[PDB]
Amino acid sequence: CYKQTLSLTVLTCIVSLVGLTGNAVVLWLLGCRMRRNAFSIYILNLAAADFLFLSGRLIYSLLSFISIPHTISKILYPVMMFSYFAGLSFLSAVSTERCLSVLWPIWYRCHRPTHLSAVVCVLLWALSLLRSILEWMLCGFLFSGADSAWCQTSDFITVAWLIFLCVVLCGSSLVLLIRILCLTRLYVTILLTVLVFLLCGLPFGIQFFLFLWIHVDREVLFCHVHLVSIFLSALNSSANPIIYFFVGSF
């Protein structure tokens, strides 16, 4: 299995590098701008969530080759997954307000509070933290000797949290298509953002927390599901500054 592990891990770093710099430019461009519309605050927060995730993924992948302390991973994992989940919620938030722009356009442009995007983004940051602290408590050192049924619920909530973010993303994107139908870019962009989420961003996390409590073959699950999901996640986060910012910038 030495071919597969080295092939994908090297590629993930290159995907990380092409995207980690692709999100710094977004953070630089959107940070300097002063207009800062509703869409831009979400993209700014989504670019921030990708920076920590790719930094964690790049650092983690390098240590698979080079040597370093093993305790470093203790401070590297619960930063990636705090940033992986924040980015996935910011995408469900973009499509929700994208739908509200079409259903109620006058309300969006005239009656929507100006700091709704700021408040919703800090709430989603708080929710991701609350999930992470709950996991570190019920699954780890503070319930180590109690029982193994306290980590199981912390993984059941996480899977139930990821499904909700798919329903909010896909439900919002489906309702928009109905309102417009009842236009080439509108279909292409909507179906592109859903597919890059369903099969590039969501697979990891769903398999990590499902298979963490369902037994499967080690060879299939590791070299073909866990490593492929790692590579796909960095592909989604790298693709987000393109799909959301630079498509409209040129």
Binding site: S73, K74, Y77, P78, W136, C139, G140, F141, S148, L212, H215, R218, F222, H226
Partner: peptide
């Protein structure tokens, strides 16, 4: 717990 591989031991 028994079937968990290395990375499933995150903490």
């Amino acid at each position: 717990p028994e079937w968990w591989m290395d990375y499933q031991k995150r903490y």
